[PDB]
């Protein structure tokens, strides 16, 4: 049904939905998350 | 508490342990989980729907 204005108009990708729930959060970094032990 | 030998709440601020419990409500549980199964069955009837349409 094209009758409107419009005739001018989970490999790594559903993991990307939780990863874009994670993209601003701790990429891997693994040292930081292992060196927060010994600064005290 | 994590082994359900002891049903209550401890404290550190005021130091007051308080034991209480009330888990089972089948009025909520059995009804709503059977509605979840009902909705799965209605999704199973969605193809009778999508078959009579097209």
């Amino acid at each position: 049904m094209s009758e409107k204005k419009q005739p001018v108009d989970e490999d790594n990708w559903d993991d990307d939905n939780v990863e874009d729930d994670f993209s601003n959060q701790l990429r891997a970094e693994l040292e930081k998350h292992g060196y927060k032990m010994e600064t005290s | 508490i994590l082994d359900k030998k002891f049903h209550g709440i401890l404290d550190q601020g005021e130091g007051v342990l308080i034991i209480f419990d009330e888990p089972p409500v089948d009025k909520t549980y059995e009804a709503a989980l059977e509605t979840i199964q009902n909705m799965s069955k209605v999704v199973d009837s969605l193809y009778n729907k999508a078959k009579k349409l097209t």
């Binding site: 989970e10 490999d11 790594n12 993991d15 939780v18 990863e19 729930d21 994670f22 959060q25 701790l26 990429r27 891997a28 693994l30 998350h33 292992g34 927060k36 032990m37 600064t39 005290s40 | 508490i1 994590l2 082994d3 709440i9 401890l10 404290d11 550190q12 601020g13 005021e14 009330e22 409500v25 009025k27 909520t28 549980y29 709503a32 509605t35 979840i36 909705m39 209605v42 999704v43 969605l46 729907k49 999508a50 349409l53």
Partner: protein, 378 residues
Amino acid sequence: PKNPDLRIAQLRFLLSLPEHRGDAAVRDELMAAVRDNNMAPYYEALCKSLDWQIDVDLLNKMKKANEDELKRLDEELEDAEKNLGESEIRDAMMAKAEYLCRIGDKEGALTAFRKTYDKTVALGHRLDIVFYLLRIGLFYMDNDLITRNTEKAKSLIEEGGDWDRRNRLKVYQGLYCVAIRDFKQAAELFLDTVSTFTSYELMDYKTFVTYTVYVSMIALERPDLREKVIKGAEILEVLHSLPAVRQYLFSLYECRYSVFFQSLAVVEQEMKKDWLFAPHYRYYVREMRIHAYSQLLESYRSLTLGYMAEAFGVGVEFIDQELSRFIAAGRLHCKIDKVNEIVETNRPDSKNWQYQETIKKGDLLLNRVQKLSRVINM
């Protein structure tokens, strides 16, 4: 005849993630090339590895030897098919031609898989097919291979099946369920542990022990936790050769958290350094952390960051971003304060959301079936 090529899976991953040893892959894999006459360890190391100063003549004379074994196969196949044998010479060529696919590229796959793919007649002539496409689908990053040949095996090989090889299919499906982060199904399919001592498909059953602990620490409940690693020992011998795994599971059974930092850091070192984990490790760290944090808050309510900083160290503004994004990740039902320093454990299940989910389904479902009943008029 799968285990050095599962080491090739190991070693193509060694070429993939660790660039700390940027040519250890071509080291032990070129050794695995100059033994067993395997030529894919410089086909795919000609594609993805280094730019090859000189190994041309000393490995293309053995590509000519690859052609020698390939053409004595390509003469044995006709000089042996003279006998009235149903798929016998087809089996003798499929063994060494999928072993050529082990040796070479997807030329071996197209002259082996597609050749003994159609005319299959028996239990082994489809068992070896499903397993020897499962090998290369486990080796590369493919999904249609390792799942759709097992779907063929559920169709073709079973008819109800055997007792062992369907559990071997369960082992392969649980290996995809640990390749993807399918938590419940990995451990559910790794439940049995009676028929997988060491086949020709297990270059390390202790890596199966790692695969069952690395998912049982998440998915398995606490009565299930004691039911698996307390009530039974059949995994606990082969991981009582690995005591820190047992120690970490009993500390998980205890709630002591600085050794969670310790041994979870061990598991996360290996989680970078074990394959089928590299698109998937990011969820694991915070997921195990919150898997402890749930029972942590289930201890009590008037908690702090000092009595928890005993377990955390300086978990003060660590738990700022940590627990705040656990709150903002739709997780960890709690309330938390700064200087009054409240903690909250909450959510009895008969409250509002279990009352809500019915119309949550049947509003979109409602107007779905309603518009489906509005196509009927005009």
